[PDB]
């Protein structure tokens, strides 16, 4: 077996990791204090949950996570939370100054006096693992800290841990849920600084998840808490491939070979179904075909795009719960007869399907109901490039008058970094269209 | 003592890893070299009399040492480039024995790379690098790049101008902003025969197009380089490819009169004003040049148009630009050595703007400018353009 | 816990700082002895931003007062609240700068600048995490004009990662008849542009005209202007001392309100306008306050916000108004079809809502915008700076201390470039 370490960064990152760990504990049955009455061993090596959690002699389960934040406002609440005895104090690192929505800070001003300590803490967890696969980064492009500090840590690790995979779960900023006016600069800087430090990266449109929570879940004003509970489901469905004894994308290296054909292109679209509310629990029973067909709905997609107007390079379907291959064959045939999608003839990868005998789970009194089946579709299509087009519009307009640019150059940054980052974005956009040439 | 005891210590200090140490050593090597050259120029003695050949080899290896270590990066890259520019300028201004060596090629490549990558440099020190690189190139192109008196090496003339004309069509606006001045700062013997091509390439940039809308800094440098070329070549009849004459003066004046009507309003604001600034001085130094050689070339219609445009530009709500406009107008009106022809209402203009009211009146202050500019409405010629220019100030925002 | 170090220099600077501290102490509920006696828990969740928690539950201010002349020092030491300021935070000499900028920045004010750095450094060592320094002085004089610039230039070299905010008080011929004021103002602005991220301009002519017309006072003294200055200061620093949804720190506020490096001068204001003595007379509402925040009469500078573009807009409300009621009012004034619509109240404005109201008033409002009209404050000093420079009047005093015409022409060129940039940006496309 092989272990894994999740490195969370920023406010959004730390808020998403707590919910993910809570969902994992509710699924595997881990108690708040860290006691698995079903486990019949004291140490890890023969079970299956040892990839994410770590066992000790006293039966305590210490989640393999490295939470690092600059503002202690959120870490103080995360420490005194319900799972105070779960996470180790050494894993939680806090700073003394906030970036205040700035990348040149989270990277050079506030990222220099914290990086020398983050590595010493990550080494303590890396030495305990006999075979580490890679890293599971959780941050957001909007937040200045979550972007700058994450990019600094990523490249810092590229030197030491070079022969290790790298993953990401960023959150694409939206105009409605915007905390900074410099969101476009930080995003275009972090996408260019770590375009080579990420083997695979997942983007979460704040608009798509908000619309999903407002329509599907039927919520008036979905708060960050509700948006984090919904993303936890997708995170668990994605990590089930490595947590359980499955047979599809069991290792982080398999993600770069079955989803990321081109090293440069590493932004695969993801979708998860169904999305039933708690009130309408036993209202309707959707079979595998319905949930598989709902994946092709722009409203249900995690990012606002139009895959219909684009080719497909790699596609991976993952079923969870009561699902039989006989029923999955019906959906596979319907995808071809009813629906129709083209494919890139120059792409090596193709279509893959997998099933896992693990039913879903929801938090007591939550927003989502305990459905009987779940489906997760990961498709790498060029349509996602549209999401990168609008992002370049705002940045370009702002840098046309060079507003809020002096605040970055005067914090350990050069004026040429912006030109380099948008020259890289232009090249990526051009390659996105060149890959989908008839 | 400075040539036998201090120069060796400044030649070794350049290998210092310290960044503040290398800049100082380069500046000292340049200054002491210039001083020794000036001292030797008194006794019409060569520059190698004070400095030995061992020290001379240092001046050649200083560039190789900087190119090998790749010190032209980071924050100190701009400082190193600025220091090397001044060093090369002071070396070329002293007539060193470096002509026909790889050192000249290295200096040219470094100057091209510096004039090639300008957007990467901060805006707080871009004008210095732009005005130093062009000066160094001119000193090098007016010292080393020559085959005989009155001529130059054709191998370099057939490539430098070609590369520059292929660099004046660069989408990046900072590339043209740096290449126009570099091409315009060339000497007169290096423009013989290739003057028409340079003028056409510079005029192609001054023309506005759908793609070049907010390209004001490039158009400003395009006019600045044209003015520099006109001032350098001078005037010479029967030679349109060697200097300015009556065969191409009309086309040159047309390009200068067309940029004055630029009133672009980008997101930054009224940036077009910049394009007008260089468009005014370019119309001044030129009008005087002909006045000091062939004043008959200046036409009456063109002179009247320039006068009316300057009068309109000297009555704008802006204060910094109106001051320069009034200064240019006064310099053009008071110029009487020889007097400039085609001056509309010359007696009335002289009576309304005497010589004593030039340095005592503050044109930047509207109070000490509008009372004297409004009187121009009495004249017929200075009525339409003057009123059009004053309407902007009589109904603006300030 | 972000702390801020407050510094005061010059007679006017110290007089303004004392009043501002007294106001923010009376509003927080702190008796002049040092203990706490308020009746609200919100007056302690952010008291550490400007008060150190010493032994015995006492709150020690952080005001570092410096003055070459031993005048205002003794007055503040024996004031209504003089017993609050630490006693070794007072740094003074005997003879000042004699209304010369080259005295309080080179020969005299640079003699106590070393004791100032030791004091400001001893005060910051106790803080857990410093955010940014602060200074309150007047462009008029030498110890306010030269000492402030010297300290701003000396602190930026040792703390480049700290915000630098000032409260320059531009003088006016109506308040003072001194003739060596234009030079001191020009030289101060020359240094307050290349080493300052934010500067709150409080022109004296505006307050003089307000006291002459609005308040209808007989002979407006310095106290009437100091009261308004302290009121505006307390209204501006409302988010940095009380909770709220808009948790805009100093750096975040400077980044969101100052898009350009050189352009950073604001036009602070405050409403309703009152005076000393009585105050309770008429209770204002939210519509009336919004209609009055954006009037050129409620501004503390001689500038018309309507005549000029709007770089960044911001407003802070104080009283029982709700951010929901404020948003309803801020979304109907940026619409033409809407009734009682205004053309000078711009769009994308920043807005806040406070609970603790000011002293002697139940509802108030503060405006912190940056309009191009502020250029008028820079041109009025330009003219007076040129007419006196051509004749070289009172220039021997400057040339004898060490200064030269080089610095004068550099400051003149900088002011001209700033005015030109302001005029150019004033004419910009809205969309
Ligand atoms: N999905 C999601 N987005 C979040 C969350 N918290 C913040 N965001 C978004 O992320 C961006 C701001 O990032 P933050 O995490 O607040 O920034 P930071 O990493 O704390 O760094 P600073 O800039 O110093 O505050 C905005 O687009 C927010 O809307 C969260 O819990 N979930
Ligand atoms: N609003 C206001 N302006 C003041 C006050 N005191 C002085 N001024 C103005 O500030 C200028 C004088 O500067 P001061 O602060 O008195 O001088 P200083 O900074 O102590 O400097 P020196 O004269 O060199 O000792 C004049 O324009 C005064 O009108 C005050 O209490 N309030
Ligand atoms: Mg944060
Ligand atoms: Mg005094």
mmCIF file of N, CA and C in Angstrom, chain B residues 124 265-271 273-274 317-321 359-362 364-368 397-398, chain C residues 261 306-309 372 375-376 379 382-383 386-387 390 413 416-417 419-420 423-429:
data_model
loop_
_atom_site.group_PDB
_atom_site.id
_atom_site.type_symbol
_atom_site.label_atom_id
_atom_site.label_comp_id
_atom_site.label_asym_id
_atom_site.label_seq_id
_atom_site.Cartn_x
_atom_site.Cartn_y
_atom_site.Cartn_z
ATOM 1 N N UNK B 124 9.723 53.057 -12.976
ATOM 2 C CA UNK B 124 10.440 54.076 -12.221
ATOM 3 C C UNK B 124 11.851 54.319 -12.740
ATOM 4 N N UNK B 265 -8.897 58.816 -26.260
ATOM 5 C CA UNK B 265 -9.393 58.798 -24.883
ATOM 6 C C UNK B 265 -9.477 57.339 -24.442
ATOM 7 N N UNK B 266 -8.363 56.812 -23.940
ATOM 8 C CA UNK B 266 -8.309 55.434 -23.479
ATOM 9 C C UNK B 266 -8.800 55.345 -22.034
ATOM 10 N N UNK B 267 -8.716 54.141 -21.462
ATOM 11 C CA UNK B 267 -9.150 53.951 -20.083
ATOM 12 C C UNK B 267 -8.308 54.771 -19.113
ATOM 13 N N UNK B 268 -7.032 54.995 -19.438
ATOM 14 C CA UNK B 268 -6.179 55.788 -18.560
ATOM 15 C C UNK B 268 -6.592 57.254 -18.548
ATOM 16 N N UNK B 269 -7.118 57.756 -19.663
ATOM 17 C CA UNK B 269 -7.534 59.142 -19.751
ATOM 18 C C UNK B 269 -7.197 59.763 -21.090
ATOM 19 N N UNK B 270 -6.812 61.040 -21.079
ATOM 20 C CA UNK B 270 -6.439 61.752 -22.301
ATOM 21 C C UNK B 270 -4.948 61.537 -22.543
ATOM 22 N N UNK B 271 -4.617 60.333 -23.012
ATOM 23 C CA UNK B 271 -3.220 59.998 -23.265
ATOM 24 C C UNK B 271 -2.718 60.672 -24.538
ATOM 25 N N UNK B 273 -2.558 63.547 -25.359
ATOM 26 C CA UNK B 273 -1.761 64.732 -25.057
ATOM 27 C C UNK B 273 -0.273 64.444 -25.207
ATOM 28 N N UNK B 274 0.175 63.282 -24.724
ATOM 29 C CA UNK B 274 1.580 62.915 -24.866
ATOM 30 C C UNK B 274 2.007 62.959 -26.328
ATOM 31 N N UNK B 317 -7.270 73.629 -21.520
ATOM 32 C CA UNK B 317 -7.538 73.618 -20.056
ATOM 33 C C UNK B 317 -6.307 73.114 -19.298
ATOM 34 N N UNK B 318 -5.541 72.188 -19.882
ATOM 35 C CA UNK B 318 -4.334 71.598 -19.227
ATOM 36 C C UNK B 318 -3.345 72.727 -18.922
ATOM 37 N N UNK B 319 -2.512 72.580 -17.888
ATOM 38 C CA UNK B 319 -1.567 73.644 -17.454
ATOM 39 C C UNK B 319 -0.139 73.309 -17.897
ATOM 40 N N UNK B 320 0.334 72.077 -17.678
ATOM 41 C CA UNK B 320 1.689 71.678 -18.044
ATOM 42 C C UNK B 320 1.885 71.711 -19.554
ATOM 43 N N UNK B 321 0.874 71.281 -20.313
ATOM 44 C CA UNK B 321 0.988 71.281 -21.766
ATOM 45 C C UNK B 321 0.820 72.684 -22.338
ATOM 46 N N UNK B 359 9.533 85.593 -19.779
ATOM 47 C CA UNK B 359 10.021 84.969 -18.557
ATOM 48 C C UNK B 359 9.264 85.414 -17.314
ATOM 49 N N UNK B 360 8.641 86.593 -17.343
ATOM 50 C CA UNK B 360 7.912 87.097 -16.186
ATOM 51 C C UNK B 360 6.505 86.524 -16.082
ATOM 52 N N UNK B 361 5.887 86.179 -17.206
ATOM 53 C CA UNK B 361 4.533 85.639 -17.218
ATOM 54 C C UNK B 361 4.605 84.132 -17.015
ATOM 55 N N UNK B 362 3.770 83.617 -16.115
ATOM 56 C CA UNK B 362 3.706 82.188 -15.818
ATOM 57 C C UNK B 362 2.528 81.601 -16.589
ATOM 58 N N UNK B 364 1.750 78.512 -16.874
ATOM 59 C CA UNK B 364 1.121 77.400 -16.170
ATOM 60 C C UNK B 364 -0.081 77.861 -15.357
ATOM 61 N N UNK B 365 -0.062 79.098 -14.875
ATOM 62 C CA UNK B 365 -1.175 79.624 -14.097
ATOM 63 C C UNK B 365 -2.238 80.183 -15.036
ATOM 64 N N UNK B 366 -3.469 79.660 -15.019
ATOM 65 C CA UNK B 366 -4.506 80.221 -15.903
ATOM 66 C C UNK B 366 -4.696 81.720 -15.737
ATOM 67 N N UNK B 367 -4.592 82.230 -14.508
ATOM 68 C CA UNK B 367 -4.768 83.661 -14.285
ATOM 69 C C UNK B 367 -3.750 84.472 -15.075
ATOM 70 N N UNK B 368 -2.501 84.012 -15.114
ATOM 71 C CA UNK B 368 -1.429 84.678 -15.852
ATOM 72 C C UNK B 368 -1.236 84.069 -17.234
ATOM 73 N N UNK B 397 -14.023 70.386 -16.871
ATOM 74 C CA UNK B 397 -14.363 69.911 -15.535
ATOM 75 C C UNK B 397 -13.717 70.727 -14.428
ATOM 76 N N UNK B 398 -12.448 71.098 -14.582
ATOM 77 C CA UNK B 398 -11.783 71.925 -13.585
ATOM 78 C C UNK B 398 -12.565 73.214 -13.354
ATOM 79 N N UNK C 261 0.195 54.658 -7.514
ATOM 80 C CA UNK C 261 1.162 54.891 -6.433
ATOM 81 C C UNK C 261 1.253 56.356 -6.032
ATOM 82 N N UNK C 306 -18.096 67.240 -7.262
ATOM 83 C CA UNK C 306 -18.854 67.094 -8.500
ATOM 84 C C UNK C 306 -18.005 67.454 -9.713
ATOM 85 N N UNK C 307 -17.177 68.491 -9.596
ATOM 86 C CA UNK C 307 -16.318 68.934 -10.694
ATOM 87 C C UNK C 307 -15.043 68.101 -10.665
ATOM 88 N N UNK C 308 -15.082 66.961 -11.333
ATOM 89 C CA UNK C 308 -13.950 66.057 -11.406
ATOM 90 C C UNK C 308 -14.407 64.612 -11.364
ATOM 91 N N UNK C 309 -13.541 63.727 -11.851
ATOM 92 C CA UNK C 309 -13.848 62.307 -11.861
ATOM 93 C C UNK C 309 -13.858 61.755 -10.436
ATOM 94 N N UNK C 372 -10.673 64.062 -8.394
ATOM 95 C CA UNK C 372 -9.650 64.852 -9.066
ATOM 96 C C UNK C 372 -9.692 66.319 -8.662
ATOM 97 N N UNK C 375 -6.904 68.485 -7.096
ATOM 98 C CA UNK C 375 -5.867 69.208 -7.823
ATOM 99 C C UNK C 375 -5.892 70.695 -7.496
ATOM 100 N N UNK C 376 -7.073 71.245 -7.205
ATOM 101 C CA UNK C 376 -7.162 72.660 -6.862
ATOM 102 C C UNK C 376 -6.320 72.990 -5.638
ATOM 103 N N UNK C 379 -2.708 73.422 -6.998
ATOM 104 C CA UNK C 379 -2.445 74.563 -7.867
ATOM 105 C C UNK C 379 -2.386 75.865 -7.076
ATOM 106 N N UNK C 382 0.936 76.196 -6.015
ATOM 107 C CA UNK C 382 1.894 76.322 -7.109
ATOM 108 C C UNK C 382 2.114 77.784 -7.476
ATOM 109 N N UNK C 383 1.026 78.525 -7.699
ATOM 110 C CA UNK C 383 1.143 79.937 -8.046
ATOM 111 C C UNK C 383 1.950 80.690 -6.995
ATOM 112 N N UNK C 386 5.578 80.060 -7.335
ATOM 113 C CA UNK C 386 6.314 80.565 -8.489
ATOM 114 C C UNK C 386 6.590 82.060 -8.377
ATOM 115 N N UNK C 387 5.570 82.848 -8.028
ATOM 116 C CA UNK C 387 5.756 84.290 -7.913
ATOM 117 C C UNK C 387 6.867 84.637 -6.932
ATOM 118 N N UNK C 390 10.659 83.376 -8.594
ATOM 119 C CA UNK C 390 11.311 84.150 -9.646
ATOM 120 C C UNK C 390 12.172 85.261 -9.060
ATOM 121 N N UNK C 413 8.844 70.437 -10.386
ATOM 122 C CA UNK C 413 8.574 69.520 -11.486
ATOM 123 C C UNK C 413 7.676 68.375 -11.039
ATOM 124 N N UNK C 416 4.163 69.727 -10.790
ATOM 125 C CA UNK C 416 3.615 69.939 -12.126
ATOM 126 C C UNK C 416 3.211 68.619 -12.767
ATOM 127 N N UNK C 417 4.048 67.588 -12.628
ATOM 128 C CA UNK C 417 3.714 66.284 -13.191
ATOM 129 C C UNK C 417 2.480 65.696 -12.518
ATOM 130 N N UNK C 419 -0.003 67.395 -11.119
ATOM 131 C CA UNK C 419 -1.164 68.148 -11.584
ATOM 132 C C UNK C 419 -1.532 67.731 -13.003
ATOM 133 N N UNK C 420 -0.527 67.515 -13.854
ATOM 134 C CA UNK C 420 -0.798 67.094 -15.225
ATOM 135 C C UNK C 420 -1.458 65.722 -15.255
ATOM 136 N N UNK C 423 -5.081 66.111 -14.139
ATOM 137 C CA UNK C 423 -5.911 66.692 -15.190
ATOM 138 C C UNK C 423 -6.159 65.691 -16.311
ATOM 139 N N UNK C 424 -5.159 64.866 -16.629
ATOM 140 C CA UNK C 424 -5.330 63.868 -17.680
ATOM 141 C C UNK C 424 -6.328 62.797 -17.263
ATOM 142 N N UNK C 425 -6.236 62.323 -16.018
ATOM 143 C CA UNK C 425 -7.166 61.305 -15.544
ATOM 144 C C UNK C 425 -8.568 61.860 -15.330
ATOM 145 N N UNK C 426 -8.699 63.169 -15.093
ATOM 146 C CA UNK C 426 -10.024 63.757 -14.930
ATOM 147 C C UNK C 426 -10.888 63.538 -16.164
ATOM 148 N N UNK C 427 -10.277 63.499 -17.349
ATOM 149 C CA UNK C 427 -10.999 63.269 -18.600
ATOM 150 C C UNK C 427 -10.735 61.832 -19.043
ATOM 151 N N UNK C 428 -11.529 60.914 -18.496
ATOM 152 C CA UNK C 428 -11.416 59.497 -18.800
ATOM 153 C C UNK C 428 -12.795 58.928 -19.098
ATOM 154 N N UNK C 429 -12.823 57.909 -19.953
ATOM 155 C CA UNK C 429 -14.082 57.279 -20.324
ATOM 156 C C UNK C 429 -14.664 56.516 -19.140
#
